[PDB]
Design a protein around this nucleic acid. Structure first.
Length: 95
RNA sequence: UUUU
């Protein structure tokens, strides 16, 4: 009972900014590991993003990660997966 | 092994 909605708002903002960095053009131009994990439509499992060190440092609460991304104009969520909103299909690469 |  030490968990409170108000005391996760800043954490959500740090998570949102971190994940928006992964899906930035600047990062995607060099992030071959991430692109090699994408499906042909650009989607990645949100749980894969949650495992990355800078996200995992901030939280292991998957609801907070989902909430942080509903707040984003950079990414699109469908069910368990997330992709860049703009031209996602340009980025996938063979595994 | 990773600002994957």
């Amino acid at each position: 009972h030490h968990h409170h909605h108000h005391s996760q708002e800043l954490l959500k903002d740090y998570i949102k900014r971190q994940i928006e960095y992964y899906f930035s053009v600047d990062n995607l131009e060099r992030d071959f590991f991430l692109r090699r994990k994408m499906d042909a439509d650009g989607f990645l499992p949100i749980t894969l993003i949650a495992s990355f060190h800078r996200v995992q440092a901030l939280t292991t609460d998957i609801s907070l990660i989902f909430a942080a991304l509903k707040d984003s104009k950079v990414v699109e969520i469908v069910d368990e997966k997330v992709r860049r909103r703009e031209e996602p299909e340009k980025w996938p690469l063979p595994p």
